[PDB]
Amino acid sequence: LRVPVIDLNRVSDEEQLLPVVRAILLQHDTFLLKNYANKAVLDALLAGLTTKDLPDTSQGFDANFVWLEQYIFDTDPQLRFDRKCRNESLCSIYSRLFKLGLFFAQLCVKSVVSSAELQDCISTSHYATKLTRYFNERDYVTFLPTGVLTIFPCAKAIRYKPSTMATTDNSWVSIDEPDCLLFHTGTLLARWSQGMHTTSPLQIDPRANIVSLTIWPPLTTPISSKGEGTIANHLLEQQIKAFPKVAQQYYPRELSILRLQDAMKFVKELFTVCETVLSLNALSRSTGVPPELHVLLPQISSMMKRKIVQDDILKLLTIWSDAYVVELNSRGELTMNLPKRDNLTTLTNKSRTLAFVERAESWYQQVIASKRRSSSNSKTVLSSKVQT
Amino acid sequence: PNVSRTIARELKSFLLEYTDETGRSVYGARIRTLGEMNSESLEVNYRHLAESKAILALFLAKCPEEMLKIFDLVAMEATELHYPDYARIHSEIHVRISDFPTIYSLRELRESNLSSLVRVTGVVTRRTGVFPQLKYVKFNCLKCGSILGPFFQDSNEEIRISFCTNCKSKGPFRVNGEKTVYRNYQRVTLQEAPGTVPPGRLPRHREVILLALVDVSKPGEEVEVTGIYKIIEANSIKRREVFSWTEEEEREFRKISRDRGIIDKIISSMAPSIYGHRDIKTAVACSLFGGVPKNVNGKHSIRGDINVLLLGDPGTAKSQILKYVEKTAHRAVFATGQGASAVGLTASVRKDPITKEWTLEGGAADKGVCLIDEFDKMNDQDRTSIHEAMEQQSISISKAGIVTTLQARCSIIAAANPNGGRYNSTLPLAQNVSLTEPILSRFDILCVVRDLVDEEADERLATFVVDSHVRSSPIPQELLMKYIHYARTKIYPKLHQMDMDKVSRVYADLRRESISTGSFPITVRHLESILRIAESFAKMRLSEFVSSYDLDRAIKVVVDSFVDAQKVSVRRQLRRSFAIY
């Protein structure tokens, strides 16, 4: 939970603060920048983000559906896409903070590989200012930043959702530093640096005013060697968009199912918790006992901390049928068991996980020939009905 | 066995490879935080190593005592190659096994759960700490004056030694613990919570051992402990935390709350045994549903609870309403007098006779509602402790070597009787009750009943009580008690400055009229009380904010409590409040 403070006039020395700033973004992620050349022009922008008059058109304040309002103002050079109200202070800060992004990129990549390779990373300067207004706060669900380098002013506004990077004790920490410019690094920048960067979320806080500046790499730049197939523009364009834009852009091939954005990753971790909780009870050297569904749902509820409906286990049965028997006991409770009597070995547990992920890959692979996941709702398996 | 040697090198390779989020090894940050702050507690989630190796999870679930001999050694080895000379200060470092999926109850503790890991919920009581307990003994034989020693754990009293080596005597033996083992104490008695116990049954209780985790637990709160079962030997404690709301019942609660003005239906559903009158149950329902606690920049904590006070002749029913809400409301604690229930509200240092020593305990529902019967019949300690808990929301313990200020944000429902039986309506309530004004000022609602001579009450009360004896429209009880827990844990209705300033106009009339005709005044606490009653009615209405007519019911609740708590000579105030009625 170390938060080193160093002047950014001393980084312009270039012989003493490159490793200190680099060591934090490889360990503590978000770095603390104080006393930038902007003084009273950063506090004069809080009266100009309250417009809220503009439509989306890859711009505009976007409220995902409600208290969360994200206003992104598309840069003027971009051809034939703009919405201009007034936004003079936003343009002046956009021109000034370009030097903060170029200088931060110069200090970041001069202790890694080369400081001459970032001039084509900032070349286009197409990044749009992101002005975030929260209504009078759970408005920010756990999420990751868009651009490679995000430098935002904030009052506090920042926590750390459960994840493992900065402050290795993995407790949620709220940090409030007066006179503070906080730098947020993106997911794609971690891929360019192959695992050096992470993310941090926003939490419930009294002050709803958040100004976030994310600087975007050009449309034509590939990312290392492996990203020659997926360019920074393609991956970041797939990442952000907007809810009206996701409705418009991702549209061409219908299916509001959207399971690719939704079910995949969450449903395939159900087997990992469920396989360990059926070896937690059924496997014991003491007094038998049959695995019941009433004591299984709360344990998986503890695993993900999320509410678990009893139908998710039925979806797990639909994808992998032969592991769990759905027979219902005479008392009304629905028991499940395993075919083996010699119990699940750790190697058999790993083989079951590989078989479950392979089966999910097979279902996703066969279902997507109709049109990336295409359309499935993860239909529940039919529960055997009691006779007569 | 040598099989632990292939286990050790497996998890030694595991701690250096766990990168779950963004390729970052969180164990290096965990080991630098325990090494820089000199901690001995290491945190490991069960899901992490369970996703890595299920055989280690099966070994931890089967034999955790031999599984714990590998964990501390590999943690000390990792701390030694990460930090030099760490063994000079700290010899051993324990681990904290958290995130147990199968949370058990106290009534499911059976013979099959022996020598295994178990996560149980409960409430802690009986705090005895930092004492040297025993595990070995020696004994001095006085006849020949000799020494002999066995073993003694944590359940029996002591293993009588009565046969010497060569004396062959039954002489008097003395306990030598001047060559003996180390001691660590945390004798805590844990109990089952009353908000999840089935009806008809009694909550069980066990004894827990705490070693290496003392005085970080708060007595009278819900707790989650993960330990081994043999007497439970706790490994990890959690002070953050079966009748709960589901997805199939949460949509119908909004559908029920949207139609047909459910506030009066909840009022009619409050008393099924008798007819009653809405003045007791309106205060009871707004006290159990409660308001919201708010602070401004970390300070100025307002009390979100509502403490109601019942008064009247002892022939009427005042204990049946609290007896119904003790079963109905969650975490409801019925306490009485000197100590009918052998548990109280006040901190105390006292002697204990089971082992015959001195101990300290801060008695007891931090989110719940405490019910006090016969409020006028108490001593100085339980009056001052409830006055401190009614004034601010904390109770301090400053004795037996411990100093702890615990949270006391509980609602208070008190019932009392006047001096002499009769209410004596030609005198105020301050001359009627033996209590004074600042203990009366904490109670915002003062409900009082009287005697009814007329045929109306004779036609209804006797017929309902004879209908109850001749037999051997509202909201049902189960949906109501599930709605209480659903609304009290999800919403927080605020207020908007659009037209709320009008209540500051009507308070400006209502304060002034209490000076010229009445003797007792109205203060800012009544304004805080009607805002809490209006937000409690908005909580019961399940709205986003408080409406404009919730304050009308709030001002009706404060007029029929304050005007009714005075003489008959404030009768003009019965018609003076008729313009806003």
Swiss-Prot record, chain A:
BP-aspect Gene Ontology terms: cell division; double-strand break repair via break-induced replication; pre-replicative complex assembly involved in nuclear cell cycle DNA replication; regulation of DNA-templated DNA replication initiation
Q: What else is known?
A: Present with 2190 molecules/cell in log phase SD medium.
Q: Which GO CC annotations does the UniProt entry carry?
A: cytoplasm; nuclear pre-replicative complex; nucleoplasm; nucleus
Q: Which family does it belong to?
A: Belongs to the Cdt1 family.
Listed A to Z, the keywords are:
Cell cycle, Cell division, Cytoplasm, DNA-binding, Mitosis, Nucleus
Tell me which domain of life the UniProt entry assigns to the organism this sequence originates from.
Eukaryota
Which GO terms fall under molecular function for this chain's record? DNA replication origin binding
Species annotation: Saccharomyces cerevisiae (strain ATCC 204508 / S288c)
Q: Where in the cell is it found?
A: Cytoplasm; Nucleus
Stated role: DNA replication licensing factor, required for pre-replication complex assembly. Faithful duplication of the genetic material requires 'once per cell cycle' DNA replication initiation and elongation. Central to this control is the tightly regulated formation of prereplicative complexes (preRCs) at future origins of DNA replication. Required for the recruitment of the MCM2-7 helicase complex to the replication origins.
Subunit-level organization: Associates with the MCM2-7 complex. Interacts with MCM2, ORC1, ORC2 and ORC6.
Tell me what this protein is called: Cell division cycle protein CDT1
Main location, first listed in the record:
cytoplasm
Curated annotation (Swiss-Prot), chain B:
Q: What is the effect of changing C167 to Y/F/S/H?
A: Loss of activity
- Where in the cell is the protein located? Nucleus
| UniProt motif (Arginine finger) ranges | 441-444
According to the UniProt record, one GO cellular component term is: replication fork protection complex
Q: Which residues form the MCM domain?
A: 262-466
Provide the alphabetized UniProt keywords. Answer: ATP-binding, Cell cycle, DNA replication, DNA-binding, Helicase, Hydrolase, Metal-binding, Nucleotide-binding, Nucleus, Phosphoprotein, Zinc, Zinc-finger
EC number(s) given by UniProt: 3.6.4.12
Presence of the UniProt keyword Cell cycle in the record: yes
Which chemical reaction does it catalyze? ATP + H2O = ADP + phosphate + H(+)
What's this chain's function?
A: Acts as a component of the MCM2-7 complex (MCM complex) which is the putative replicative helicase essential for 'once per cell cycle' DNA replication initiation and elongation in eukaryotic cells. The active ATPase sites in the MCM2-7 ring are formed through the interaction surfaces of two neighboring subunits such that a critical structure of a conserved arginine finger motif is provided in trans relative to the ATP-binding site of the Walker A box of the adjacent subunit.
Mention any additional remark: Present with 1690 molecules/cell in log phase SD medium. Early fractionation of eukaryotic MCM proteins yielded a variety of dimeric, trimeric and tetrameric complexes with unclear biological significance. Specifically a MCM467 subcomplex is shown to have in vitro helicase activity which is inhibited by the MCM2 subunit. The MCM2-7 hexamer is the proposed physiological active complex.
Q: Which family does it belong to?
A: Belongs to the MCM family.
Record note on quaternary structure:
Component of the MCM2-7 complex. The complex forms a toroidal hexameric ring with the proposed subunit order MCM2-MCM6-MCM4-MCM7-MCM3-MCM5; loaded onto DNA, forms a head-head double hexamer.
Name of the protein this chain belongs to: DNA replication licensing factor MCM2
Q: Which organism is it from?
A: Saccharomyces cerevisiae (strain ATCC 204508 / S288c)
